[PDB]
Amino acid sequence: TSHSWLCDGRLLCLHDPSNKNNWKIFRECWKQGQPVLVSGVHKKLKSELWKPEAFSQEFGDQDVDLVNCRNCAIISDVKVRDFWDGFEIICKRLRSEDGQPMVLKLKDWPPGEDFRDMMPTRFEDLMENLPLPEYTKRDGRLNLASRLPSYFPKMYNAYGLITAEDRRVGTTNLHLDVSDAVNVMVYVGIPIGEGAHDEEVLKTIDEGDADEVTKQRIHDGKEKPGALWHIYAAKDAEKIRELLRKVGEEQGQPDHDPIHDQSWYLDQTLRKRLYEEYGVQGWAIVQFLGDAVFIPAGAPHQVHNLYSCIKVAEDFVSPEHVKHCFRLTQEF
Ligand SMILES: O=C(O)CNC(=O)C(=O)O
Ligand SMILES: [Cl-]
Numbered sequence: 001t002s003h004s005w006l007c008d009g010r011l012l013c014l015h016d017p018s019n020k021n022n023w024k025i026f027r028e029c030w031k032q033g034q035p036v037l038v039s040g041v042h043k044k045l046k047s048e049l050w051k052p053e054a055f056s057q058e059f060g061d062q063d064v065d066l067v068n069c070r071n072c073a074i075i076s077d078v079k080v081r082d083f084w085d086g087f088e089i090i091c092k093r094l095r096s097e098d099g100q101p102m103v104l105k106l107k108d109w110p111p112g113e114d115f116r117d118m119m120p121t122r123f124e125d126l127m128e129n130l131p132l133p134e135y136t137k138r139d140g141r142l143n144l145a146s147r148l149p150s151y152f153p154k155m156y157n158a159y160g161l162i163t164a165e166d167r168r169v170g171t172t173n174l175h176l177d178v179s180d181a182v183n184v185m186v187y188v189g190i191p192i193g194e195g196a197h198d199e200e201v202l203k204t205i206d207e208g209d210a211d212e213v214t215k216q217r218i219h220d221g222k223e224k225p226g227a228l229w230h231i232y233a234a235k236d237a238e239k240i241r242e243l244l245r246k247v248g249e250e251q252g253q254p255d256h257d258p259i260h261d262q263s264w265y266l267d268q269t270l271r272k273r274l275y276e277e278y279g280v281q282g283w284a285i286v287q288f289l290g291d292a293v294f295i296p297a298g299a300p301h302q303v304h305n306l307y308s309c310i311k312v313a314e315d316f317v318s319p320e321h322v323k324h325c326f327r328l329t330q331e332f
């Protein structure tokens, strides 16, 4: 079974998403609470379905709210095409008071459980090509999601954050989710209208603590980097809460939950600190076009888009983690 290791030997990378024997290798990492990466998923999909132009053409007239990733401001009652038309074409992006193009995220779209209903062909294309299908598919035999009683697909679409100032901002702030999930990068858009940003992208992953083999995927492989993830083991979540309670009190704090508050992005400062002061070393992961990231239930994580990303995630409930999922459901 074709695979290799990233993050200095600590992250499994599976290279063939439809290899039936994948579970054997996957499960050993997964039962220890490690995330897992599967590359090559884009090569299985119907490309034409996962274009920003197609999303604009087909659903542009819908009403939506957006989020400015730099200041968290909400842009109320805008149109879907406003987002998608500026995904790669910088001059088409909605502008702040100062007339500058904004780095934006599309909020709650599609809304509710409307994905399957709103996008049936995309739904079938994703689900027919998810890796580890017995775990990940709604009706997969190791997916307990639908098999349990009432006590246990989402898009993440946003532009990139490339500046030096941007490096301490999250596309999605540190949080955890209650079930297992797989997050697939189905499209990476390289924006035009400000010239090349390759060196900023590279300095951002380096400062994000990415390993040398991850960086060869750019230098040698010439792969298109989508997003930079930091993921932590579910067990390490309290040690991370402890750090953030303290740091927060150093600007005026309650015995509350910083991870649930989803207000923190761990920059290179706090990550060195979390490691030396709490022993906690996470996984710095660059998600390229076609990479599927498996995030264990309750494993805290944050995301920082480098370029413009179309991501689609499927939740599931594995036997290995079904106790976590139960315990996380009650606390949440
Ligand atoms: O992609 C993002 O911005 C955030 N993704 C997730 O939080 C996830 O898959 O759980
Ligand atoms: Cl499987």
Ligand SMILES: [Mn+2]
Pocket: 175, 176, 177, 301
């Ligand atoms: Mn998440």
